[PDB]
Amino acid sequence: LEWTWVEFTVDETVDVVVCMMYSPGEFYCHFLKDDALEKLDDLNQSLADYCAQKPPNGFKAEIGRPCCAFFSGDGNWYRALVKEILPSGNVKVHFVDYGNVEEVTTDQLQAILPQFLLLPFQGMQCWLVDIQPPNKHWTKEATARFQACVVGLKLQARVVEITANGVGVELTDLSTPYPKIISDVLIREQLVLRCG
Amino acid sequence: LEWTWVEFTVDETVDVVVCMMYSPGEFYCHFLKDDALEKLDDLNQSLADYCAQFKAEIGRPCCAFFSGDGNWYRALVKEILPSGNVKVHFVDYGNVEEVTTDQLQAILPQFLLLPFQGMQCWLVDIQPPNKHWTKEATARFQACVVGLKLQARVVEITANGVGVELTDLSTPYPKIISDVLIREQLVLRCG
């Protein structure tokens, strides 16, 4: 079984919606290109049908292995990678199209098939460029301010740096004629420090 | 509140016991120097007394209750969840657990004098065959260290941990743990 992530060019500009959030140094976006949101809806529908059926699959958990995992947050199956195997016998899974990690049981895992791995994984890890925490850790305040800048919004992302594990982006809100660069907000408000 | 980790010099050899394990690239050790084990016990007893009688922020120190053995230990706040629960990193052992607000207490500054003792380690000069450490590799590493004091040589010191070469000296025949994992096809050479 093999798979890919969404791929970018340096300085590519592309619209995003943030699908998961941990900090300004760690958040996940859907990049709205190549009919992503629609292809991802279609795949998920196909996973519901596939996963729905009796009997389910014998899945053997191994670290970094792809699977289908049930997400109790909304009661549907999604694509996932095994992240951890716990003493209890439960398994933590990384939901690859969204960026959240959940602890599941063995009944909540099913083997994935190669035809469900054609669409690139859509939960792209991001960080804002040119900022750093005032001390050594992102504060709740800095994170909640960031969240209030992106919630319910589509933003322009410029892909400034590409690493193996994700992308550093500059995020701009273009929902009005006054562009708002999210980092500006966080720096101005004293919630984060300039970096670089 | 401010604190430190156990400090080392490059190529320092010191005895260890592994206190928490995740993979050959991520395991935690007590380094047996400067009366560490004894000073940590002493500290833990002081904490049990103090806790027996907190505003969460990411990276903030505290006392947290560990349900595995039912005692209080030093921790840093790692995550704050929607439920209102908090994940804490037990800084003297290296495990992370989800606790409730009742399982947290502020820590006193005098409890932050002993350096934090769960030192993150990785074995130097090896890598996963594919992209991730397998269960078999980790399980074999665990078999090599369970119940054992090993000699560690600190080869590289980073901000976030130490790369070590581990040797079992429990018999006259020294056993370098990486050797075992490489020889048995479980990990690939690196460097």
């Binding site: 699908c19 998961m20 959030m21 941990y22 900090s23 760690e26 947050g73 909304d74 969204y98 959240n100 992102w138 709740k140 994170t143 909640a144 969240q147 | 990411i58 790692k78 995550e79 704050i80 969840l81 929607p82």
Partner: peptide, 8 residues
Amino acid sequence: AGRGLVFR
């Protein structure tokens, strides 16, 4: 509650 923000 669904994919809710987790402070890290």
